[PDB]
Design goal:
Serpin_fam; serine protease inhibitor; Serpin_CS; 2 domains; serine-type endopeptidase inhibitor activity; binds a molecule of 4 linked components (NAG-NAG-BMA-FUL); Alpha-1-antitrypsin, domain 1; about 375 residues; 5-stranded mixed beta sheet; about 30% strand; Serpin_dom; 7-stranded antiparallel beta sheet; alpha+beta
Amino acid sequence: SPSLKIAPANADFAFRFYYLIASETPGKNIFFSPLSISAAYAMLSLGACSHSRSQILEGLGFNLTELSESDVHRGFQHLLHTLNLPGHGLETRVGSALFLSHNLKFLAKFLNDTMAVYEAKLFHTNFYDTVGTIQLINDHVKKETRGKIVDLVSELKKDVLMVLVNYIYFKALWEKPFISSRTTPKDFYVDENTTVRVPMMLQDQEHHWYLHDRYLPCSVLRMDYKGDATVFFILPNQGKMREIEEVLTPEMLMRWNNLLRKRNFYKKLELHLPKFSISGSYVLDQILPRLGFTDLFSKWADLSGITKQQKLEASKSFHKATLDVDEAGTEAAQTNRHILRFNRPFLVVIFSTSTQSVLFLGKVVDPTKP
Ligand SMILES: *[C@@H]1O[C@H](CO[C@H]2O[C@@H](C)[C@@H](O)[C@@H](O)[C@@H]2O)[C@@H](O[C@@H]2O[C@H](CO)[C@@H](O[C@@H]3O[C@H](CO)[C@@H](O)[C@H](O)[C@@H]3O)[C@H](O)[C@H]2NC(C)=O)[C@H](O)[C@H]1NC(C)=O
Ligand SMILES: *[C@@H]1O[C@H](CO[C@H]2O[C@@H](C)[C@@H](O)[C@@H](O)[C@@H]2O)[C@@H](O[C@@H]2O[C@H](CO)[C@@H](O[C@@H]3O[C@H](CO)[C@@H](O)[C@H](O)[C@@H]3O)[C@H](O)[C@H]2NC(C)=O)[C@H](O)[C@H]1NC(C)=O
């Protein structure tokens, strides 16, 4: 398979991006889509030339002696094609867009290659009209995510001459949904200092795929969507968040996935899981240098495949993604001796089974925060 060749690299980047955001901002909500970030910078590398192209692909976790550049783009084409398939009420549409300054011509080679493989959306704007470009960029991302991601870019300089945005429209239905009449406000303990009131869903009729980890200090719940998608909710033991984050590798995800396919762990459960929405918005041009993209955001960057007329330094890149846990899914005679209350911080890993890739990755510290 082409898409199976790029999956190890993309998984590596996901948890590398997580560990950085978790380290630099410890007590805060995290939520992003490694795949939309990977796909967009893989798309952007079609415009980079010689050395600066290698640094992008190597930053994304690819081994350029193992894989060719052709293997990466064919990998992403077969990955995106699989995720765009009709689905069982399941939508995972990865997308990206570049807004280049007017008075800079896109090269035809770039326009063709980006659109033919990644279906990227390329635009001209006048960055001196700062209120205009922000309106133009945000409405495009709003239109493409169908309202779900709004106000992506809050501010921009006038010297800026290119902005990259990446997003993912996500709609999914639970295999086993919750009944909304049984959902009531209950306590959520963010830490030993403070407590918050959140709507808490309840389900004690179904069996679930869940385990209590022998080796690590956490419980892992696996809740399927309808279609080829799944959510891993990892609930660490009290005070042991950063201990689980310390070991949150791609090898660890595949351990929990393989363990939760065994019928041994398919047992009855009184599940209490909150009904909430969090968002994570990330200024990628400031974050990605620390993951080994220092060349792309500098004077020595070579993006002459995008345009020859000017040097393309001082370029911004933004990404936003929202987690929606609802009774249905994302949109708005049973006795249990086993329970799981998600009433303190937990990790979230939305995982595509058809493409073996992490669609979303994040942490829920306070579910109420606007
Ligand atoms: C990045 O990739 C390279 C290349 O990996 C692939 O190369 C293609 C062509 C194909 O052969 C495929 O099967 C390979 O996976 C990795 O480089 C290789 O590293 C291993 C060490 O783990 C080397 O094997 C060793 O060979 C020496 C004798 O030369 C022995 O002493 C050892 O016992 C062992 O067998 C191998 O020579 C390297 N291959 C090449 C083509 O140079 C590289 O490890 C990988 N980076 C990673 C995983 O971080
Ligand atoms: C617009 O781009 C598409 C896809 O571009 C990707 O594929 C190549 C070019 C590579 O550089 C990669 O990095 C790009 O992202 C082009 O579609 C491809 O067209 C070629 C031939 O026109 C096909 O490859 C092979 O061509 C040789 C002869 O040169 C034949 O012997 C082979 O049988 C085979 O046809 C390839 O299948 C196409 N790829 C896809 C994904 O459809 C397209 O040509 C380009 N258009 C323009 C005007 O530049």
